[PDB]
Amino acid sequence: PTLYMNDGMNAQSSQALHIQTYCNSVRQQIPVDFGRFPNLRESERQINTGLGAARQHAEHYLKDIQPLIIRNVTNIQDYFETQNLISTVMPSGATKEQWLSALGMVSDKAKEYQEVSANTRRTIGSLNDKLIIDSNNYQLIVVNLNNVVNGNNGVLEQLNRDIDGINAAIDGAIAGIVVGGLLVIGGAIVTAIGAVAGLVTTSTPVVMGGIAMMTAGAGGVIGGAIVLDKSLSAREKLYRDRSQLNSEVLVASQIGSGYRGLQTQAQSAVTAATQMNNAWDSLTSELETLNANLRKGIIDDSFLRQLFLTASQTSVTKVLDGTKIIKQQMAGVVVREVPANQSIADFVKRLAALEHHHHHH
């Protein structure tokens, strides 16, 4: 259970930094301006209404959920510091009753923290559910606009699936970068937000879902930009290839892709939250089994003492080490401003060229 707890914590913490950055990109998205086309006023208002709801979903995550996930790390640290302390306090000839008191104190903490993880899982499950509905309904606003300007709905839908497909690649590259950097002592996570497509001027730039996450090592040395550059540039390319689509349909499409991308992050958060809740479940079960087996007299104090002792010398070390690195990295995220005349792909491409020069390669 100690390693299950470790893996749950690592997966939820890394994914939490990913959806956090995605939510920031949704919050920073500027309303769409189709002022130059009075006949698209209705579409402009439907798109800004859906965007407002997306910003509220993102805000809900940042303010109401992110802190519970960070609280979970702290709860893991307190749990294991407490289990460890039991090991150092219980003297030699401690009675069954004293051991039952001690087991009780750790089971109470574990159940308290299991319930916090469970409530976190429900809250993210609900947000994911709402995002599935809102992102699915948003697509009708885009088709409707495409119909108002007699665009080809086949070409639009193809672009939508192509962007979904490249977003899996971008997500997987960001996930691998963050997982790989989460447990580096002295390492930091670096994020940037920027337009998802190449810029062209009077169209509203879409930063929603335009994210980069990279690592920084000793001396602020960026890692991950070379890897990430490939999938970011590919998205920019896929948009470039549909410059025959109406400009406003393209913007509307970019928000839709950002709305679906947000729902994808929330599904990843559900999966991580489930894995963490299952880890707590197996921790409380183990304690309940030790509580019953000591009472049934199937085990004894001596076994329990050695069980907690070994744990404290072994897998608990890894968890406690992880809790400290994870809190530093989640608290030390470095936010890079992207200039208004650079896409997220442009920005990372420039960081990738700097990364090549630092590697002399």
Numbering used by the authors: 4 to 204, 207 to 366
The authors write:
Tripartite α-PFTs are members of the ClyA α-PFT family. Proteins in this family undergo a large scale conformational change from a compact soluble structure, where the hydrophobic residues are hidden often within a β-tongue motif, to an extended pore structure with the hydrophobic residues exposed in two extended α-helices which insert into the cell membrane. Here we show that S. marcescens has a tripartite haemolytic α-PFT (SmhABC), and propose a mechanism of pore assembly. We present the structures of the soluble A component (SmhA), as well as the soluble and pore conformations of the B component (SmhB).
As expected, soluble SmhB folds into the family observed β-tongue structure, with a five-helix bundle tail (α1, α2, α3, α6, α7), and a head domain containing three α-helices (α4, α5, α8) alongside a four-strand β-sheet (β1, β2, β3, β4), which includes the β-tongue motif (β1 and β2). The head domain of SmhB is largely hydrophobic. This is particularly evident in the β-tongue and helices α4 and α5, which together constitute the predicted hydrophobic transmembrane region (G175—L233). The B and C components interact at a binding interface located around residues 95–123 of SmhB, this could break latches 1 and 2 on the B component, releasing the β-tongue, C-terminus, and N-terminus to initiate the transformation into the B component pore conformation. The release of the C-terminus from the β-tongue agrees with the observation that the start of the conformational transition in NheA occurs at the C-terminus. This is further evidenced in the structure of a second crystal form of SmhB, where comparison of the B-factors for the two chains in the asymmetric unit revealed high flexibility at residues 85–124 and residues 280–320, corresponding to the proposed binding sites to SmhC and SmhA, indicating that movement in these binding regions can occur to facilitate complex formation.
